[PDB]
Design an enzyme around this catalytic site. Structure first.
Site, mmCIF file in Angstrom:
data_model
loop_
_atom_site.group_PDB
_atom_site.id
_atom_site.type_symbol
_atom_site.label_atom_id
_atom_site.label_comp_id
_atom_site.label_asym_id
_atom_site.label_seq_id
_atom_site.Cartn_x
_atom_site.Cartn_y
_atom_site.Cartn_z
ATOM 1 N N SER C 49 -15.679 -61.456 19.870
ATOM 2 C CA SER C 49 -16.036 -62.830 20.327
ATOM 3 C C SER C 49 -14.831 -63.804 20.314
ATOM 4 O O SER C 49 -14.957 -65.027 20.652
ATOM 5 C CB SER C 49 -17.205 -63.441 19.512
ATOM 6 O OG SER C 49 -16.797 -63.724 18.198
ATOM 7 N N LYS C 92 -21.875 -70.589 15.104
ATOM 8 C CA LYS C 92 -20.516 -70.864 15.516
ATOM 9 C C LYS C 92 -20.395 -72.306 15.976
ATOM 10 O O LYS C 92 -19.506 -73.092 15.534
ATOM 11 C CB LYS C 92 -20.124 -69.890 16.639
ATOM 12 C CG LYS C 92 -19.767 -68.472 16.011
ATOM 13 C CD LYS C 92 -19.633 -67.412 17.101
ATOM 14 C CE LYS C 92 -19.333 -66.017 16.339
ATOM 15 N NZ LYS C 92 -19.424 -65.007 17.452
#
Lengths: 603, 133, 133, 133
Positions: C49, C92
């Site tokens: 990611s 996140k």
């Protein structure tokens, strides 16, 4: 070549589906001629044999059926007698006749020429007891009858699935008057080995290993050492003499259950006859009829159409149009579920709906996957054209092994002859995957030699793969993706591609071909069939294609297409919609891409 | 021959001769014979059954054949895959850079099979690569 | 190279190299060495990611392009430069909000993330309210 | 529902009466286990306990052969033989995908537990499920 619906259809036509089937039971071992002839030899010669084949074949039921038909002379009477106060032996008398010796001794070589040494010791103990008034006792002096039988048809047949020492060899009981003193010949119980004398003992290889009784069992067969099991407590023991073993042993297990046993030289010495069951049978009218008489004898109410669908599902299980799965136990378990859905009648519909419901029960992982695809969380294309990109096909590594598309990309840049699998370099591939990649590099370098070594670096990646990937079946998709990246050739995204390739560019057979095809169909269907989707696969897999009804029907409707190919170039011509030659073909475009890269690589 | 008679077999000359030659073939040495008398005896026991108690040349050759039949499932599968075109082998014609090599399967009784092997050559800087290695 | 990444991390890096080399071919092979580092990372790091952030950082280093530091970046990238969905998308985003908030919101902070994660965004109240404000 | 799948809880137990040494057979000192209590109805066990307790193989023998042995002690100088009986019960096993993992490698697990009833980790976020909750 295009595969028409008529070329793909593999299923048995059904006439008069609901008519009840009426057929006689087949012979034990039908379609298993190898195992049947091995075990005939083992019975004719008195050899021990081991029955080997996959789980759920019905090896035990077939063996027990076949043994039931044998005949032997009526087994001797079987007994323990004392040879002293601390010592016993197993002996045989001719049948029904220990009742006369047991009453004769109740008179506490008369007419029993075999009971020689038990008599001496009965007399000798009678002797020294006149000669001391030396007490009782109790008496532990009379014979112990282990077994006796009225005839040898069928012979004794003892299947002991749980091969522990007390179950194989018997057990000592201890009577307690004072401490734990309790010898006596008459407190010994027989084990399976005793019950099988004159007949057959059947044991499972996996139990002898799990129970750790293989070494003791070897000693029984080789030396006649059969020791009833004692307890750590007993302050003295009886000595038990060995005896002449009269029995034939059949061991049963999978190829894997036998594995440790086989490394032992004594296993092959003792089990000389291997009776190996095939995992499949010929898909013939005779075996369809035998399977029908076998199911009737199991108690099912079967219709013709129920038989036919079971038989064809066994073909599809085998992934072989001309062979059927030989596992009768698995066919039976499927028929049991179908029978419930048919309200006790096994019909064509109840079988197809049982098959469907098994799929529904294992479908959560695919329902999650298809939802992620639909929501755009997994990025897949099933229409349009793209350079350097192809839907390859994979199987998920958990049972029941669903198939799925896996988007694969190839990118080419000017560089010094490298073909990189990103997944291999990251450590996700196994050895066969890595082999397929090297094999493609071998093909490309040797096919395109006018520049010297290839002026390109090509990297291949499975776009959203998170787990390890194994096998060679993505070779064709990677090679077409690479040729497309080199020549800038847009490729159809509505056709998925599966197939291994050799160094020469020929396409080789892959595993799980039905799951792969059907996995691409399910994704095309969930996204809305366009009418032009399909799969290119190896011609070498045509003996394995036994596609589900829904796929065959889409292909018959023109809404899905199957192409079989022999070479990687034939796959590329289909995907790129053009011929390699007749040039302006693809080959000229590939060589012009390599010329362009070569010019970039040298200023 | 005198050892088998003393073990109790009814042996004919041709039964002895075939056993003796099978022991040679077991040793894979034209001038040596396998010394394992127990294994010769176990083979003679199976032959004796097929000869109805007489150990003859035919009963020995047929005992040898039936041992092979009993271990032949893996080869029957392999030959069916070859015939169906699932395994691609050529046994006629000519091809560049391609040869039928021979391998033995690693499970007893160690059948032999062809294994198609290819070599491809391209312009490059002196490398001989075994893909399998 | 220090051994802190796992296999999927390493994959994302190779994937970016694949993108860059094939995207910029007028010089032949790329005339640059690019090194990427997570500045203060002490533990192993896994997953793909950070691919989008590494590729933008690299393109910025190549063209000398100043980049906004008020926007954090999450997203995986394929060889073709498309942005793919990542895991933990809510944690996140909210982690970048909490740090911006602890340092005093400037009014222009935010996160760039994959369109492919819109089916997963279920942001906490405090974040939604800041975006509404 | 027997969450703690030990041999004496599944199969029952022998008590021993002591008059002299530890002699104490009698049919009437045998206590039933869960298997006995579930006859005619349902037995529910946890996959993780059969594995932790090491009772999976004995439990297989119960379902396949009707071998249900009450647990004995190492002391007893004789034992009762307990004959097998016709098992009349339906078994439900419960566990996570991970609890089943070792079980599934056993062919006999799939033979005996033919119906998988798999719960989804999420439900549709619909008005009907909000109302059901």
């Amino acid at each position: 070549m295009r595969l028409s619906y008529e070329a793909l259809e593999w299923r048995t036509p059904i006439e008069n589906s609901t008519e009840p089937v009426s057929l006689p039971p087949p012979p034990p071992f039908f379609g298993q001629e190898r195992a049947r002839e091995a075990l005939e030899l083992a019975i004719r010669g008195g050899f021990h044999a081991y029955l080997v084949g996959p789980p759920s074949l019905g090896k035990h039921e077939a063996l027990l059926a076949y043994l039931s038909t044998q005949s032997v002379e009526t087994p001797p009477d079987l007994l323990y007698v004392p040879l002293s106060e601390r010592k016993v032996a197993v002996m045989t008398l001719p049948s029904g006749q220990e009742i006369h010796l047991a009453e004769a001794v109740e008179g506490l070589f008369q007419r029993f020429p075999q009971a020689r040494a038990y008599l001496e010791a009965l007399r000798a103990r009678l002797a020294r007891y006149a000669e001391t008034g030396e007490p009782l006792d109790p008496a532990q002096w009379r014979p112990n009858l282990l077994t006796s039988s009225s005839s040898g048809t069928p012979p004794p047949i003892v299947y002991e699935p749980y091969a522990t020492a007390p179950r194989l060899f018997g057990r000592l009981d201890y009577l307690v008057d004072r401490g734990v003193w309790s010898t006596n010949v008459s407190l010994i119980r027989p084990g399976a080995v005793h019950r099988a004398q004159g007949g057959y003992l059947i044991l499972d290889a996996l139990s002898l290993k799990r129970e750790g009784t293989w070494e003791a069992f070897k000693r029984a067969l080789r030396n006649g050492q059969v020791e009833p099991v004692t307890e750590p407590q007993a302050p003295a023991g009886l000595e038990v003499e060995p005896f002449p073993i009269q029995m034939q042993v059949m061991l049963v297990g999978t190829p894997e259950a036998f594995e440790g046993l086989e490394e032992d030289p004594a296993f092959s010495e003792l089990f000389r006859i291997r009776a190996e069951f095939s995992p499949t049978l010929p898909a013939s009218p005779e075996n369809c009829t035998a399977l029908g008489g076998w199911l009737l004898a199991q108690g099912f109410q079967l219709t013709q159409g129920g038989l036919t669908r079971l038989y064809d599902e066994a073909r599809r299980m085998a992934e072989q149009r001309d062979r059927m799965d030989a596992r009768l136990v698995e066919i039976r378990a499927l028929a049991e579920e179908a029978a419930v859905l048919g309200g006790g009648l096994l019909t064509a519909e109840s079988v197809e709906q049982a098959i469907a419901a098994r799929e529904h029960r294992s479908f959560l992982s695919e329902e999650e996957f298809l939802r992620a695809v639909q929501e755009g969380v997994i990025r897949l294309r099933t229409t349009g054209r793209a350079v350097g990109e192809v839907n390859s096909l994979v199987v998920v590594e958990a049972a029941p092994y669903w198939g799925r598309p896996a988007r694969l990309t190839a990118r080419a840049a000017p560089g010094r002859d490298h073909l990189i699998s990103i997944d291999r370099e990251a450590g996700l591939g196994g050895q066969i995957f890595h082999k397929a990649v090297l094999t493609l590099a071998g093909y490309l370098r040797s096919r395109y030699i006018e520049h010297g070594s290839l002026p390109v670096t090509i990297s291949l990646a499975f776009e959203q793969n998170y787990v390890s990937i194994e096998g060679d079946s993505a070779g064709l998709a990677e090679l077409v993706a690479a040729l497309s990246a080199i020549g800038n050739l847009p490729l159809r995204q509505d056709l998925a591609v599966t197939g291994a390739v050799d160094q020469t560019g020929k396409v080789l057979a892959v595993g799980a071909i039905n799951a792969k095809v059907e996995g691409f169909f399910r994704v095309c269907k969930a996204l809305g069939l366009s009418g032009t989707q399909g799969v290119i696969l190896p011609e070498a897999n045509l003996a394995n294609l036994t596609l589900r009804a829904e796929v065959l029907e889409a292909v018959r409707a023109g809404q899905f297409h199957i192409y079989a190919v022999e070479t990687a170039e034939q796959a590329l011509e289909i995907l790129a919609g053009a011929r390699m030659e007749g040039f302006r073909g693809l080959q000229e475009k590939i060589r012009a891409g390599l010329e362009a890269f070569a010019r970039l690589e040298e200023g």
